[PDB]
Structure 1
């Protein structure tokens, strides 16, 4: 398993943007052009190039050789390279990617105060109860943990939000480990939270427990190679 991160301390220049556009498919280019907000374009762009860069290095291909598809729920894959399982998430200044020889999910979300209404309506009763147990001091932060942990799972599985959020329960324990309640039956999965930035909650979901201790940062320059 490898986890790479890109921190957007500044916006992409026009040069960088145009150079990054060089690596991607015509379809992906038109998609980036259809974004109303530039930063959404940049996040999607960077994520695409991150996968191209990591997998091209690993298989000794050129970046632009990689051909993406998606399965029925929109999960991206590389049909030519089915052993190269990956997943991307982006929010705010972060673009992050996970890579493994088995299916993998990752999520990061910028925290913003928010009501518990989304948790009440969508999360499992157990999670809602856990959430209500936190002091007001901590409920936003715990909501974003739950959100990113659950999303790491549904992204690993590949169905995303077609999988009801109340069909499984996650818990972040005081020692820092995550537990998941699944009908197993279900194959093993493991969730790790990462603290990469105090304004953000991030988690990764993988088929095995061999996670890296920290993530590897990647610069724009490395990606422009």
Structure 2
């Protein structure tokens, strides 16, 4: 393959929670994604969810279009049995290990992609829980973190910090879950993270948090933790198939390589 070109990991964020597309721009977006994905996005009752899903899809296609140089119209995205987006086996892809993943919680849709490292991502906004109080919420969530994890979570007198740590510990678990592609069906209590360092500054990728699966350290797993802003935590779980801050994209970035896929339809 003459036009080789060494590929590097991608870390993109898009603030969909403050993206306010016009009828025209949405329709642009909607036509730029795959038919099945259109219909789905169009089933979401709320802008919040539809925009996230949409930002997610536009970002994957951008990533493949740009990094794999497949013309957007010919990007064949699919999904594993358990719902993970994957690129079709038929290549335009001499990166057999090239994989990616998105998350969309809070105001952002984030995406990681790597050429070799198999990867999972999860973003989480520290927001007051939708039902009940924090303590109540944490109660509802007991069965999902280890005692040591909870001691760390309640180790802070401020319930916002507590929530911060909870969402962090959660995101770390999802990144891994999404990395391995398994779904909700994975007893999250099997996973214990040693959250390190406790206090994370914005504008920095922390690689120090190590994981224990079933009490044995999962030494084959790196975790990249950042706060893309003061309120969103992002975990990127990286396994070997055996520095880079997130880049805030805007709409035109998302569409830069877009070609319309589905026809005109009122």
2:229 match: secondary structure: coil
1:199 matched residue in structure 2:
231
Match 1:123 to one of 138, 145, 151: 145
1:19 matched residue in structure 2:
28
C-alpha displacement of 1:136? 2.9
| 1:46-125 mapped onto 2 (5 Å cutoff) | 46-79=55-88, 80-81=90-91, 82-101=96-115, 102-113=117-128, 114=134, 115-125=137-147
Residue pair 1:110, 1:201 contacting (<8 A) in 2 also: yes
* CA–CA separation in structure 2 for the residues paired with 1:213 and 1:178: 17
Q: How many equivalent pairs are there?
A: 222
| 1:164-183 mapped onto 2 (5 Å cutoff) | 164-174=187-197, 177-182=208-213
Consecutive unaligned residues of structure 1, counting only runs of 5 or more, are: none
Residue pair 1:108, 1:200 contacting (<8 A) in 2 also: yes
> Which deviations, in whole Å up to 9, do the C-alpha atoms of 1:121-150 show, x marking residues without a partner?
221222122223222352111111111111
1:196 match: secondary structure: strand
Consecutive unaligned residues of structure 2, counting only runs of 5 or more, are: 1-8, 129-133, 199-205, 257-266
C-alpha displacement of 1:224? 1.8
C-alpha displacement of 1:92? 2.6
Match 1:163 to one of 183, 186, 189: 186
2:260 matched residue in structure 1:
none
Residue pair 1:119, 1:143 contacting (<8 A) in 2 also: no
TM superposition score normalised by structure 1: 0.90
Alignment root-mean-square deviation, CA: 2.0
* CA–CA separation in structure 1 for the residues paired with 2:64 and 2:46: 28
Match 2:46 to one of 33, 37, 41: 37
Match 2:14 to one of 6, 29, 33: 6
Greater Cα shift, 214-223 or 179-188 = 179-188
Residue pair 2:211, 2:218 contacting (<8 A) in 1 also: no
- Choose between structure 1 and 2: higher helix proportion: 1
Residue pair 1:124, 1:166 contacting (<8 A) in 2 also: yes
Q: 1:218 to 1:153 in 2, by over 3 A?
A: same
1:39 match: secondary structure: helix
* CA–CA separation in structure 1 for the residues paired with 2:139 and 2:233: 19
